[PDB]
Point group: D2
Chain length 424, copies 4
C-alpha cells in the first residue's frame, strides 16, 4: 500500500472500509433479502437459492464495477448487474427486489460501523487496562501539577492517570449508548415507503432486520443522518481526549522536563494530527444532516468520504495511544527534580496550613506570602526565609519546617481519589 497508509490509518480499519468489504456487505444484504422474501412467498424459492449462491465477492469484476459506478453515479447497481448476470435461468431478476441503492449503502455502512466499533471497544478496553495499572503502580509518585503551564501544587502521577481513566470510562458509556440507535436496518425503497412491495413492505423490513441482527427501523431514514453524524461526533469526543493525552505526554517529554518517555514523541505527533482531522470531519458530518427531501442532493455523499477517513484516523490515534500507555516510561527522579525547582514555593500553602493553627489561618497566609516573594527575589529556599521570621520560627522548629517545605508531604487526598476511580 502507500507509504503513510499504516501511519495515519491501520490495516484492520482499512480492510473494514475497503471496496472489498463494502461490496461483501452489499452481497450479504442481497442474500438475506432474497432468503427473507422467499420465506414470505414474495419471490420463488429457486431464486433465493441461486441468488444466495452467487452472493460472493470473489465473482465481482472490479474494473467493470468502477466503470459502471462512475457512469451510473451511485455505487450499488453495478453490483446488482453482475449478480443478475452470474445467476442461471434468469433467476437473478428476483434479487434487489423492492430495494433502492441507499437501502444497501446505509445498511452496509451500519455493518461496517459495527465492525469498526468492535476494534474501538478492544482498544478502549486495552487503554483502560493500562491506565488502571498505571494509576496503581504510580499511586504515590509525587510530581508538580501545572496550571497555565506553570507549577501549581504537588500531585501524584497515579492521580494524573486516574483522571484519564475516568474520562475513557465515560467514552465507553457513550459508545454503548449510541450502539442501540446506530445498529439499525435501512430498508425503505425509493421514497421510504417500499411502495413496490405493497402490503409486504413492513413485513420484509422486519424480517430482514432480524436476519442481519439489526434493530428494525421506526421509519425510513435516508435523509435523516443523525445515526451516522452521531458516530462522527463520538469519534470527535474520543480523539479529543486522545489529543489531550498526547499533549500532556509530549509536554512531559520536553528536554527541560523529562518526566515520561514514549516506549521524539512520534506517537503523540500522529495522535495530534489524527484528532485535528477527525474534529473537522465531525463538522462535515453535521453539515451533511441538511439532506433535502427523500434523497439528499449532495449532503448524503459527504458521508461516503468522511466516515471511512474518520474511522481510519481514529484507529491510528487509538493504536498509538494504546502502544504508548502500555510501554510508557516514567521517571520519578526527574519528577522530584522539577518539584524542587521553586525551593519550597510550590508548597507554601502547606506552610500556611501548619502555621495557621498558632497564628490564625488568615494571618498565616499573609505572613507566608510575604516570605514567599522575599524568597523569590533573592533566589533562596523558602525554609531559609521562614526561619528568619520570629513569629513563624517561634511556633515551628526546623524539623517541622523543612517537613512543611518538602513537596512530597503535600499530596492531599490523591490516593483516596484514585481509589474512587478504581473501585467501580
Amino acid at each position: 500500500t502507500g507509504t503513510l497508509s499504516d501511519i495515519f490509518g491501520t490495516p484492520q480499519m482499512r480492510e473494514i472500509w475497503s471496496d472489498q468489504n463494502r461490496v461483501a456487505c452489499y452481497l450479504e444484504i442481497e442474500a438475506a433479502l432474497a432468503i427473507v422474501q422467499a420465506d414470505l412467498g414474495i419471490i420463488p424459492k429457486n431464486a433465493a437459492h441461486e441468488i444466495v449462491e452467487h452472493c460472493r465477492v470473489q465473482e465481482i469484476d472490479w474494473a467493470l464495477y468502477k466503470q459502471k459506478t462512475e457512469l451510473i453515479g451511485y455505487p450499488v447497481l453495478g453490483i446488482v448487474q453482475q449478480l443478475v448476470a452470474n445467476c442461471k435461468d434468469g433467476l437473478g431478476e428476483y434479487c434487489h427486489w423492492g430495494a433502492t441503492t441507499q437501502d444497501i449503502t446505509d445498511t452496509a455502512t451500519v455493518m461496517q460501523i459495527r465492525q469498526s466499533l468492535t476494534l474501538v471497544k478492544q482498544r478502549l478496553d486495552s487503554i483502560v487496562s493500562s491506565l488502571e495499572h498505571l494509576a496503581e503502580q504510580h499511586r504515590n509518585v509525587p510530581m508538580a501539577a501545572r496550571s497555565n503551564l506553570k507549577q501549581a501544587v504537588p500531585i501524584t502521577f497515579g492521580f494524573k492517570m486516574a483522571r484519564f481513566l475516568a474520562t475513557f470510562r465515560r467514552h465507553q458509556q457513550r459508545l454503548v449508548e449510541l450502539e442501540k440507535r446506530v445498529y439499525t436496518l435501512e430498508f425503505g425503497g425509493a421514497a421510504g415507503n417500499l411502495s413496490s412491495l405493497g402490503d409486504q413492505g413492513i413485513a420484509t423490513h422486519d424480517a430482514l432486520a432480524k436476519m442481519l441482527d439489526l434493530a428494525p427501523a421506526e421509519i425510513a431514514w435516508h435523509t435523516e443522518h443523525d445515526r451516522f453524524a452521531e458516530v462522527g461526533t463520538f469519534l470527535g469526543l474520543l480523539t479529543g481526549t486522545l489529543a489531550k493525552l498526547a499533549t500532556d505526554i509530549k509536554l512531559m517529554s520536553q528536554t527541560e522536563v523529562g518526566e515520561v518517555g514514549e516506549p521524539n514523541p512520534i506517537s503523540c505527533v500522529y495522535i495530534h494530527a489524527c484528532a485535528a482531522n477527525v474534529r473537522q470531519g465531525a463538522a462535515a458530518l453535521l453539515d451533511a444532516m441538511q439532506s433535502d427531501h427523500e434523497r439528499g442532493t449532495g449532503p448524503w455523499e459527504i458521508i461516503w468520504v468522511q466516515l471511512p477517513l474518520m474511522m481510519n484516523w481514529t484507529s491510528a490515534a487509538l493504536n498509538n495511544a494504546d502502544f504508548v500507555l502500555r510501554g510508557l516510561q516514567v521517571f520519578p527522579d526527574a519528577m522530584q527534580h522539577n518539584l524542587d525547582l521553586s525551593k519550597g514555593l510550590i508548597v507554601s500553602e502547606a506552610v500556611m496550613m501548619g502555621l495557621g493553627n498558632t497564628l490564625g489561618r488568615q494571618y498565616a497566609h499573609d505572613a507566608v506570602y510575604e516570605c514567599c516573594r522575599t524568597a523569590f527575589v533573592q533566589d533562596r529556599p523558602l525554609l531559609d526565609v521562614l526561619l528568619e521570621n520570629h513569629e513563624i520560627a517561634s511556633k515551628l522548629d526546623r524539623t517541622e519546617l523543612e517537613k512543611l517545605c518538602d513537596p512530597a508531604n503535600y499530596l492531599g487526598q490523591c490516593s483516596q481519589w484514585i481509589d474512587r476511580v478504581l473501585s467501580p
Copy 2:
C-alpha cells in the same frame, strides 16, 4: 437589547448566560459551600450565616467587577473580593474556602446548562407534539417524494412529518442520556486534589454536590472537557435536524412548488444560519478538549465564548421551528398539482406491476419503460402512449389503465409507517 439580539438569540436563553445569572450561580455555589463547611465544622456557623446572607447578586458592583476581572484575568475572584468586603466582622474571609476559580466557573456552567436544557426539552416536547398532530392530520394527503430534487414516487405529507418526528424522538433520548453525565459538580481546587482541605476534601465535595442537586464527580475534570463538549456536539446534532426541516420547508414554499407556507420563509432563514454557526462551534469545543495538564492554557477559555453563543443560536432555531410547525400552512391542492406534473411518469412502476399478469413480467417492464421515455420526450400523458401500444390496448381498457396512471393509488404503506412512529 441589541437590534438582532432576539433574532439570533432569545430573551430566555440570553438571560441564562448573562453576567447576572452567571454571577448569581457563583453566589449560590459559595453559599452552599459555606453551609456545607459549617456543617462539617471547617468554618464557624455564624460565618456561613453571614456569607449566605450576602450571596445576593443585587449587591455586586459590576463596573468594579469588570475592572478586577480584566486585571486578574479570570472571572471569579472579583466576586469573592466583594463578598469578603460586604460581610461583617471579617466573617467573609471564610468564603471560597479551599475552592479554585474553575470550581466556581465549571459548576456554574453546569447549572446554566441545566437551565438551558430545561428550555430545550420544552421546545422539543412542543415540536414533537406539533409533528404528531401533523402526521395524523395529513396522514393521507398525497404528494411527490423527491430524490436529488427530482420527483421520485408518491408519498403522503404525514409520512414526511413522521420521519422528522422519529428523528426528534432520537434527539430527546440523546438529551436525557447526556444529562446524567453533565449534571455533575466540579470541586477539586487548584490541582484537583483539594490539598488545602486535607482530609476534608472528599467530604466537602460530596456534601456540596447534594446541596446543589448535582452528581458527585469521580475525580476532578478541570482539563477533561468531555461533558461540555458533548453538550456542544448534541447541539450540533439537534440543529442539524432543524436545518433539514428549514431546508425542506423553504423548498416546499418556492413559488414554483407552493406546497407549504410559514404561518418569505424568514424563520427557515434564521434556522439555517443558526445551525451553520452551531456546527462550527462544536468543532471549537472539540478543539478545546486539548487542555494541558491541570488547567488549560487557552483551550479552557474557548468554552467561555462558544457555549453561550451555541446555546443562544440553538434556542433561536428551536423557537422558529416550534413557531413554524405550530402554525404551518399546508396546501394539498398544490401538492396534487405537482403530483400531476409528470402526467403519470411518477407511477410508471405501478403501471409495470399492474400489467405484469397481462403482458408477462418482462414485456410489462420493457413496454412501460419505453412508453415512459416517449411520454417524457413528447410531453404527453403516459396513458395516451400506453394506449398507442396495440398489445396493451388489446388487453386493458382505458378505465383500468387510468387507475394505474393515477398517482393517488400508489402510496404503499405510508399510513402503517406513520402508525409505527405514532402508535408505539
Copy 3:
C-alpha cells in the same frame, strides 16, 4: 484505482500527490542540491554526477521505504538511505548534505502545489470561457430572479451567468497573487540556520532556489505555515463558488422548475460534497499554523494529510463544473413559463411606474399594491384586477396595460451589466 477514486478525485491530481510523484520530487531536489554544492566546491563533482545519475524514482524499493518510514517516523530518510546504497564508491554519502527532512518535504510540497495549480488554472480558464459564451449566447433570455427562493423581478439568464463569471475572475486574481509567495524554496536545516553548512548555507540556499525555479526564502519557514494554509483557504474560497453554482443548477433542474439540465444533477451532487469537505480541511490547515518552535509536534503533520485530499476534492469539483458548463442545456420555454406563473405580479413595480403620470405617484403605488394583493388571493391575472379599477380603466386601455404586465418588458440594464463583465 478504487471504485470512487475518480469520482471524488481525478487521475491527474491523484498522480501529482501519489507516493511516486512525491518521491520523484524528493529526488529532483537531492539532485539539484548535489549539483549546487558541487559547483560551490562543498562536495566533489564526481560525487554529484553519481548522485544525479541515481536520482530516478524507478530504482526505489517501495516496500522497504514503507517499512523504514514507519520505523523512522518521517518520509525522507528512507529515500536518502536507498540513494546512498545505490551510488557507487560511497559517493552517495555526499547527498542530502546539510539538509533536514522537512527541507525536502516542504520543497516537494511546493512543487506539487505548482503542478496542482497548473491544473487548477486550466480548469479556471475553461470555466471562464464557458461562462463568457453563456453570458453572450443567453444575453436576452428572460427568467425570474429569485430572492429567498421566491420570485422577485425578471432578469436574463446571461446576467445570471455574468455574475458567476465576474466571481471566477476574482478567484483567478487571488490564485496569481498567492503564487509569488507559495513558489518558494525551503532549505534551512535542522533549526533553520543551516548550522552544518557554516558560511555556505545562504549560498547553497539561493543557488538551490534558482536550480528549482523557486523564489529564495527570506528566512526558514518550517513552523511558519501561512504559505500552505493560504493555498487551503484559496481552495475553500474557490470551492465555495463552485458550490453556489451546483446549488443554482440543481435548483433550476427541479422537476417543478426545469430551466436547465446537466449535459439527476449528479455533477452538482459531487461538487456539493467536495466543497463541504474542502471548507473543513481549510479550518484544519489554519489549525496547523500552531506549529511549535522550530519543528511542530503534530500540527505540521496535519498538512501531510489534508493538502492532497483538498487538492483532489477540488480537482473533482472543478472537473464536474467544467463539464457541466461546457454542455449545459438551457430551456428558455420553461424559463418563460415560470415567469408567467405570477400572472403579472412579478412586474407590479413596472406597472406602478407606468401608471404614475396618469394616476399620480401616490395612487399608482397604492392602487397597484392593493390590486396585487387581490390578484394573489384570487389567483387571477393582475391585468384583470387593474381593469376592474374604474379610475385605471378610464385612463389606460388594455393594450397599454398589457405591455406593463408583460415580464419581458422589465429587464432593466441586464445587457449593459453583462457588457461590463465581458467588454472590459
Copy 4:
C-alpha cells in the same frame, strides 16, 4: 458593558460593529445616494437636501427599530421608515430610491471592514516594529532550538523573532491585496439589475461609488460572498500566526524553561482562544458562499453573525500580541542554562565538523556519534568522553575541544539571516 467584552473583544472594534455605527453607515449611504440622484436629475433637489439633513443617527428610535426589524425580518427598512417620517413636505419618499436593503447592508459592511482593517493595519505596524527591535536587540543571544519539543541545535532569540517578523510582513501583503477587491460598492437593487432605475441604474451605481470612495462593482454580488469570505480567511491566517506566537511564548514561560516572560501567560491564553474561534468562523463564512440565486435563503445571514465576532476576536488577539511583544521580558541566563543541560550533546554536530577535516567527514560523524551515546548513558559531558578517544584527542586539544563543545559557538548564519529579513 459585559464582564468579558473587553477581554475577548476591544472597545474600538466593538464600536465599529455596534448597532450605532452600523446604522450611521446606512444613513451615510442613503445621504450619498440622494445627493447622487439629485445631481443626475433622478430625484428633486429639495428632497436630497432634506433627506441629507435627516441622515443623522441621533434621530433614530432604537426600540422601535428593533421592533420593526424583528417583524420585517431584515435590518434596513426600519431605518428608511424613520427617515421618511422625519423629513418634511413628504420629501422623504425620495430616499432609498431604487435600492434594496442588501445594497445598504453589503455596502455598510464594506465600510465597517475598512474601518476594522485600519485598526488591524495599525496593530500590524506596531507588531512589526516590535519584532524589528527584538530581532536586533537579541541578535546574538544564544538559545536552544526545539524540534518535536526536544532540543535540536542552537540558534539565537533574534533569529526566532526574525521568523515571526517575516511572517507578519507576508500578512501585511495579503491585507493590501484583498483591500482592492473588498472596498467595492454594492448597489444593484432587488435582483442586481436596478430595474426600477431604467437607463440610470449604472450611472447611479458609478456615481455612488465615487461619493463613498469605493470601487464600482463589475456586477451585482448579493449572493457572491467571496469578498466577505476572503476577509474571514485572512483573519484565520493572521490569527494562525498569532496563535503560534502565543504557543511559543507560553512554552518559553514554563517554570522548567523560564526563557521569556509576559510584560501566568494570560495574553497568550486569550490569543489561543480567540484564534480557535476565528478559524471555525472562517469555515462558516466559506459555508455561507452557498447563497442561492439572487438573495440567499440563510447563507447570507451567517455573515451578519460571524464577521463582527471574528473582527472582535481578532482585535483582542492583536491587542494582546502587541502588548506582549512591546514589553516582552527576555532572560538570556535561563536560555544559557537550558543550552547547557545536555552537557555538549546539543553541539555534537559542531564537533563532527571540526574533526571531519582530520579524520574524514563521514568517519568523524560515526566516531562522535558513538561518543555521544556513551556520554548519554553515563550522564557525563561530551568533552570528557571525547577526550577519552585517542583518535579524537590526538587531533584536537582540550582548548579546541571545549570550544567545539560550547553551545554558544554553533550559531551558524543566524546573524546574516536576520540581516536578510531586516534589509527590506
